[PDB]
Design a protein around this nucleic acid. Structure first.
Ligand SMILES: [Zn+2]
Lengths: 258, 150, 124, 208
RNA sequence: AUGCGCGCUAGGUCUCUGGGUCUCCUGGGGGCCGAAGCUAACGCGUUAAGCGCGCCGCCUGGGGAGUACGGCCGCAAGGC
RNA sequence: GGAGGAAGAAGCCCUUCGGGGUGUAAACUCCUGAACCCGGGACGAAACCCCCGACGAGGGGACUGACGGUACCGGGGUAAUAGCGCCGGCCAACUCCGUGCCAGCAGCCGCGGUAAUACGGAGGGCGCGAGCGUUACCCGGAUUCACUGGGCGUAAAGGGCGUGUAGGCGGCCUGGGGCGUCCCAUGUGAAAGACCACGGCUCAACCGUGGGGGAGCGUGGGAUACGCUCAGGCUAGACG
């Protein structure tokens, strides 16, 4: 349970309109979904408890916008539901609250499936929120930043102090907005190869990029000199750490010697 | 601005025409950890109402503690009914040495270093009242000088 | 009382009375059972409690409670007796330690093995 | 015999990021980035308001697990600190820092305290040009702590201190990376550290 | 169900018994309401159960029990 | 053992049958090497005794180690013991299954007759750790023998009253004594233990050096405010 005025602020920062539709994940009791139905047009809920469901079935009886789908959020064809339910709305948003452990995988899935959205608004966790929206030359800059800027433009709209919760949590919270762009920032010859390269690059923070690339990559040892030469032709320093590089810097390397 | 914690919740009963009627009492201390404290006792049919009423009462029965280096200016012993409280100043880096009720009262007052003791009857309500009375009866060097010399 | 009265008479000191006379200021004693039987608790409780009438090394006859799930005490078993009062039983002030002389630690305990004998069960 | 076993379990119980593992607790796998709730079956269940005793015990436990000493040694250090002159809290914190394992960790020879203990134990570390192999050794202001001559060529130490290049050490310590050595300047102040601990709670805990 | 002596701390009213410059003033007793104060409360409150000083007697949870043994007193019951 | 190590391997338990808990623990990669094997190897031991001295103070000469081939050094070296109590409140830490005032638990309150976070088992979790619990004894909490620091109308507690012995206590104004009282100096208050500082065993326990503190008592010298005593005066207590 959260104070009734904060949820208003998150919904406002979602720029919800009487025309837009919203996908909400894990309503629980159903605070958020309530304060959506009002200003929204069509609310769809993916939720699997059978325990807090009677509470949820009740709380939404007033409205006729909200609908409940008793399906796994991860084991769902999001395309199918998005096309099926929303044949009338102009634009679509996603506003939800995620239950810690499985927060990153959901966002990753929704982004990789390139659903026709405008943006994602989630509470997430403060640390995760910071990690998502980071400039190239930060301290917390990492793989997650690459993964999210590859699909959207991300920024934290506000911060939620750990004090506003009745059950006092151990960690803080934030609110992040992720506006989808009309196509990826940079073309890739192979999205998979890009993903493995990104994960291999930021394996060890302290070590220089060249060592990480040579060691971490499964067949990097087989072709060591090739990596050095391709890096050299790109005008990127081996002795430089991978942290400083921007998206385009990595993209050129991803092109590299595929 | 004021933060709140509970001293105790109790449920009392009264007889009626074939049955029992239960009323809840709450003891509430409020403070700011700056040298101001308040205590209240709220009686209501329901627990939330009792808490609200107790806080409401405490917000007016207000006491300023003359703190200095986060400790009491001088020792004091105070009797309320059959309860006795003893408070003594402490050097910096000692900590609040008290029972539940005295610790709760003193922490909100901004007191950081004190040695306390409870004597006689140890009923929470009377201990709390004794603590408040002892806090009200504290003076500094300046006050004593003003009264004496003028 | 007046200070003169304090000088004249002073203050009496209280003497603690031992709750375990039989042990005679010893942690444990060795005894032999004479009667092994069961008794019933006071009004609030209702069960059958195993009690042994033990003759100790000291010239005392006492009743000791037998804890556990089951015992193997005959009328000639050498036992070790320990301090500890059983409230509901009116007259027993002593306990029997399991797995010492003739009493064996009760079988297949798994949680509280420090008490009740019970060498650790070796599990493959 | 120190506490050996799961680590980030404590990260969690304590509800605060205790850096007890090294650089893993800097990645997205600190076990506080994920699943940041108390360990166990009943980890996600509404928590009853903590008692004063519970609060004090938890604060005391937090501290103890940051430095990884026993209860016995912790109590002895507390008793020693209380007896001395000055604020008990500051003196107590000062004493815990002077642990040789603490210091070698702080200087950056190790990424964790658990391996700083190993390096000091195995005789890789020297004090005043003499081998010392005891994690509980207390260093005074003005002691020189270096790596043994025999251990200079080990890849672990080189990799560890290479990452230390171009990063400021604590104000109460001095380091020379080139010579692979360091000097203890003075006892650290209360503010100089940043341990997420309210020492007053520990003092009151031990007061009872 | 309140040990004795002394000192201090607002008054009002009824009554017993003295003395004066006689409608009042000043002593010594017996009660009732009540300042401050004390008490867990009932209540006490210049006749204190308030503020103090001096001296004596007594208490250390209930029952067993004012019981058992011993001693002293008494003709006995019995008492300490 | 250390670092790295999955949106999370099996087994077990729970489940709303969607997963979530054990859990970076593990499995694996890299790394350091308790034990163990070789080569050295102690401090504790310089005197007694002889050599010129003088038979002295001075200077030279050897002999002597139970501990022990131990501690400790120099190389080579393998991931190489974890248990115990508790989880209703006091008091930190919750869910299933077995039994149904039975078997039991219990330090107090009490729990057990179909839900029981209180018995037994399992999963999980707290606390300590080569230790952990139990019993016996002492102090504390106990201001519960109350000097500091309690009380006696009704909770236990005013003698059934008077006279009075010993004892305890005692008005104000000057003096003498200086017994109590206070102060100064000095002797003692052994060594070890307690405190502080420094130092030696790789640190600490342990030990060493130094510095004080210390209730009390003896001796010598000071003060007279209060208690005491010896002198004198007063009327406010008391007596006539
Ligand atoms: Zn962590």
């Amino acid at each position: 349970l959260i104070d009734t005025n904060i949820l208003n602020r998150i919904v406002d920062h979602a720029e919800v309109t009487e025309k837009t539709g919203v996908i909400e994940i894990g309503p629980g009791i159903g605070a958020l979904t309530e304060q959506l139905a009002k200003r929204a047009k069509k609310v769809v809920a993916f939720e699997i408890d059978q325990r807090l469901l009677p509470i949820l079935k009740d709380t939404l009886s007033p409205y006729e916008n909200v609908t409940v789908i008793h399906q796994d959020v991860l084991k769902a064809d999001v395309k199918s539901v998005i096309e099926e339910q929303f044949q009338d709305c102009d634009e679509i948003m996603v506003v939800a609250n995620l239950p810690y452990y499985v927060t990153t995988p959901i966002i990753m899935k929704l982004l990789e499936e390139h659903l026709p959205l405008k943006g994602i608004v989630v509470m997430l966790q403060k640390e995760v929120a910071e990690r998502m929206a980071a400039d190239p030359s930060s301290k917390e800059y990492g793989s997650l930043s690459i993964a999210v800027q590859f699909y959207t433009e991300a920024k934290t709209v506000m911060i939620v102090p750990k004090t506003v919760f009745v059950p006092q949590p151990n960690v803080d919270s934030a609110v992040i907005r992720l506006i989808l762009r009309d196509g990826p920032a940079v073309d890739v010859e192979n999205e998979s190869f890009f993903f493995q390269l990104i994960k291999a690059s930021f394996a060890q923070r302290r070590k220089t990029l060249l060592n990480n690339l040579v060691n971490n990559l499964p067949e990097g040892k087989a072709q060591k000199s090739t990596i050095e030469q391709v890096l050299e032709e790109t005008n990127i320093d081996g002795k430089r750490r991978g942290e400083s590089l921007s998206i385009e810097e990595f993209a050129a390397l991803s092109n590299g010697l595929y | 601005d004021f933060e709140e914690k509970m001293i105790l919740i109790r449920r009392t009963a009264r007889m009626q025409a074939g049955g029992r009627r239960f009323r809840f009492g709450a003891l509430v201390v409020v403070g700011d950890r700056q040298g101001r404290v308040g205590l209240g006792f709220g009686k209501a049919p329901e627990v939330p109402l009792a808490v609200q009423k107790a806080g409401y009462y405490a917000r007016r029965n207000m006491v300023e503690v003359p703190l200095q280096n986060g400790t009491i200016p001088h020792e004091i012993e105070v009797e309320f009914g059959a309860s006795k409280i003893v408070l003594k100043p402490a050097a910096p880096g000692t900590g609040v040495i008290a029972g539940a009720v005295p610790r709760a009262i003193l922490e909100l007052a901004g007191v950081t270093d004190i040695l306390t003791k409870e004597l006689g009857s140890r009923n929470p309500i009377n201990i709390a009242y004794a603590t408040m009375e002892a806090l009200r009866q504290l003076r500094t060097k300046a006050d004593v000088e003003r009264l004496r010399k003028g | 009382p007046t200070i003169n009265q304090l000088v004249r008479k002073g203050r009496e000191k209280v003497r603690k009375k031992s709750k375990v006379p039989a042990l005679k200021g010893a942690p444990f004693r060795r005894g032999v059972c004479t009667v092994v039987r069961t008794v019933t608790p006071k009004k609030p409780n209702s069960a059958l409690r195993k009690v042994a009438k033990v003759r100790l090394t000291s010239g005392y006859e006492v009743t000791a409670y037998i804890p556990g799930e089951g015992h193997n005490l005959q009328e000639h078993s050498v036992v070790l007796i320990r301090g500890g009062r059983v409230k509901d039983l009116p007259g027993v002030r002593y306990h029997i330690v399991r797995g010492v002389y003739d009493a064996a630690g009760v079988k297949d305990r798994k949680k509280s093995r420090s008490k009740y004998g019970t060498k650790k069960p070796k599990e493959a | 015999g120190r506490y050996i076993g799961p680590v980030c379990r404590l990260c969690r119980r304590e509800g605060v990021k205790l850096y007890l593992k090294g650089e893993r607790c800097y990645s997205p796998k600190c076990a506080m980035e994920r699943r940041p709730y108390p360990p166990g079956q009943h980890g996600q269940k509404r928590a009853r308001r903590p008692s004063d005793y519970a609060v004090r015990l938890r604060e005391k436990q937090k501290l103890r697990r940051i430095y990884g000493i026993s209860e016995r040694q912790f109590r002895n250090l507390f008793e020693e600190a209380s007896k001395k002159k000055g604020v008990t809290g500051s003196v107590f914190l000062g004493l815990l820092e002077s642990r040789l394992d603490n210091v070698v960790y702080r200087l950056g020879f190790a990424v964790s305290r658990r391996q700083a203990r190993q390096l000091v134990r195995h005789g890789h570390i020297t004090v005043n040009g003499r081998r010392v192999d005891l994690p509980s050794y207390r260093v005074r202001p003005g002691d020189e702590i270096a790596v043994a001559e025999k251990s200079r060529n080990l890849e672990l130490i080189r990799q560890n201190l290479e990452a230390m290049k171009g990063r400021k050490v604590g104000p109460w310590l001095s380091l020379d990376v080139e010579g692979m050595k360091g000097k203890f300047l003075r006892l650290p102040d209360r503010e100089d550290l940043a341990l997420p601990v309210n020492e007053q709670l520990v003092i009151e805990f031990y007061s009872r």
